[PDB]
Design a protein around this ligand. Sequence first.
Ligand SMILES: *[C@@H]1O[C@H](CO)[C@@H](O)[C@H](O)[C@H]1NC(C)=O
Lengths: 194, 122, 124, 123, 107, 107, 110
Amino acid sequence: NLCPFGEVFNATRFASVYAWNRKRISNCVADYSVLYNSASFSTFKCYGVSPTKLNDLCFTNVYADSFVIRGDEVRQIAPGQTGKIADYNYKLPDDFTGCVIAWNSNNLDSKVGGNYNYLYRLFRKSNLKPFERDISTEIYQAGSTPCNGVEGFNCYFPLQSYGFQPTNGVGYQPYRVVVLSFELLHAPATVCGP
Amino acid sequence: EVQLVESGGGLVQPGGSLRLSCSASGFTFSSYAMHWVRQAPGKGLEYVSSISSNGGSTYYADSVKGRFTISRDNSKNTLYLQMSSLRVEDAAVYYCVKHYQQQLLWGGPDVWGQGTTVTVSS
Amino acid sequence: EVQLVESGGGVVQPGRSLRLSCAASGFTFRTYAMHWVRQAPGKGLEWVAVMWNDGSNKYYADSVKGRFTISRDNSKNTLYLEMNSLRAEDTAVYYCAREGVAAAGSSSDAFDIWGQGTMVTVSS
Amino acid sequence: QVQLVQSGAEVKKPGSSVKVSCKASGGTFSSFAISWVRQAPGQGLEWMGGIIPIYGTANYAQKFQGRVTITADESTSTAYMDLSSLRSEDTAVYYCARDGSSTYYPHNWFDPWGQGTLVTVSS
Amino acid sequence: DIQMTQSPSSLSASVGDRVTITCRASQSISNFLNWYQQKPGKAPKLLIYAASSLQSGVPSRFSGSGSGTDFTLTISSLQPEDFATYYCQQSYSTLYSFGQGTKLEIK
Amino acid sequence: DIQMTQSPVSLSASVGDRVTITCRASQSISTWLAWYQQKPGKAPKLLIYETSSLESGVPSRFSGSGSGTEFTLTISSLQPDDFATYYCQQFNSYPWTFGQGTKVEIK
Amino acid sequence: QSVLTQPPSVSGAPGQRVTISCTGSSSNIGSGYDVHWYQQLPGTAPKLLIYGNSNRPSGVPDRFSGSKSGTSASLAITGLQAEDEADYYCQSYDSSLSGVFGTGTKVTVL
Ligand SMILES: *[C@@H]1O[C@H](CO)[C@@H](O)[C@H](O)[C@H]1NC(C)=O
């Protein structure tokens, strides 16, 4: 049958980056070439395996990690990067295979005012291990005094709203990101097209 | 346009008291946390105190706590810093700053005032 | 086990003040921007107030602006709504809601959980 | 041919902390994706979290966040579960389980399953 | 503010028929629309969040459509437990606004 | 109380050079740094916020760098309006510790 | 946690085909994540009957079979005997990278 990418890319809501979503995609006949010629995808960089040849490869399962970030943070969704996203929100591993497909989406996700519920993790005691979402909301201890469950000086809540607006630049606009993470294993492959 | 003016200051005997002021105009005063940062003549910048956006949480530096008191009045758009039991070490100018953030991820000030000279001698 | 309970409602004189406490439990109170929604007897819903995620903005509908005061208390997981100069129109059933996109019990940009609703009525 | 052997039973005062071990065997520890499954006495199963010892990632479940600290020592091939702040509701039978097919994306079935670890938390 | 119109204002229908309820917006609202269901004497539970996705834990006969200004709510086959007020709210501006509701009734 | 040691303390750089200033901290702050410019007599002026983001209203010859412990403010081409001391400031942990300073003498 | 709903008890007859249903949601089953079945005799660690909604390891009879369609998933036991009087569990995965276990039927004979 036809592969369900309309529930993935054309979805009505994308999860905020601190709590992303993984959607297993198996039992497909998937044409990866028509998704390359969409004329809407800004950043299309495929690590591990080169683009324009995915129609002649099958895999065991496809897991599309999808989220939403601003314009100057699409470079952090990559192997080996850093910042306030790839260290504390969503960390890719080193030898990850697959693409990070992102496109400019100011009309849908950004609303005038805040769109105050696309949060992101800011403060954590350590860097994230790879592919580890962390939905914990305990308050971060900055100094040496104990926080005692109350935020204030030296004790900060780790979630800041992104605060999207259609008046800001193309570096402050919510770029919806889809990470087509797929890797086969010692099994008969499932997901390929013609 | 944001602008900050500081008041008070002058000459005081050792062991005396002096209240400064930092009146502000150009922004919503209740939505910002703002600090005091001092600088001795011919020396480096030094942090002394801060205050929250609603007068709740106060914070002093290590060597100045127990002798200073900071308060603010959002209805008057002022920031007050009271001193008690002064020493000769606290002869400096006292700059008044304000945050760049509104109320979270607390770090980094935005604009700087103009300072108020205080002197302590006999 | 997400939950919202209210308190404080009742009857007051027209023109006095009243506050409404919406004490949450079962979820982290800080990452969801709380609201207040109301319904007059017989009519439809009418959005009233918004407290932002942390306190950055406290907006109101155009019928209460300058008269309502929406607070927050992140330590005790409560939400306040102070009414001032209550007219005869503001009698309704006042609910408190939440929203925020967590890929969870979240309901992106929509009110999933609601309070029991306490009835504020004005009379003499 | 591949199996996991756990530690013995425990008994803990309410408020203390327990440490359960799951020593793998039969194959490599670096291609295992050991996930910790709870079971109350006479009730249904429950998922606690799964570590990947090559990456070090430990995705917990939402109930056990910050209490269950899953660690893995790839050298001696024991994947711990340092459950903390014990109560009298934590009397359970904690299993470990390899996650079936893959080791990087562990989202599959549980096979093999170890054995019972009756942590009877009372005094 | 964005004003929300919703037609009709009171509806009657028979059990099983496809009931459509239209909510129209003033200015452009990109898929940030909600619908709610308030039985008389309760507090309303969300049906459809973000104009196309059902609330997790609602019967699957409900279906919302549209993007922009006009949205319709189409129940496939009615039930005796599905007769209540249907509201229409948009999550776009800083001033959230509700519809008027359609009292669904019986023939 | 993170002791930041600023280097060099004083230097001679004329018009037509490219200067750098190192401000190294002990406890690991992480992209929480501001730079300053204090002409002698009045208050400092902010140059860089969050160690990379160039503040509006200052020329583009200033540019931040660095992450973690040590940072390097750089100036591409020297100008006659650089006869001031450049300070560094951390704001990760709440005792703010400013640097010692850098007397930029233009001979 | 246990979002995958499952009936509490299912009875039958020796020589009868009984059904065990697992009704999930859009995040756990309907997002492509499959449904697998464990068997638990009272007192031991659970076994593994079905994986990938249709397969069978070496160690199960041919009486146990399953399939999935849409959101629900099924298990069929044709011809009950004395070795089917046990607890049967239903396993899948959320989109929150967490595993979900069924409530678990109790198959009894008549
Ligand atoms: C997404 O939707 C648009 C129009 O609704 C369509 O043209 C496009 O092909 C869709 N993308 C898919 C199915 O990947």
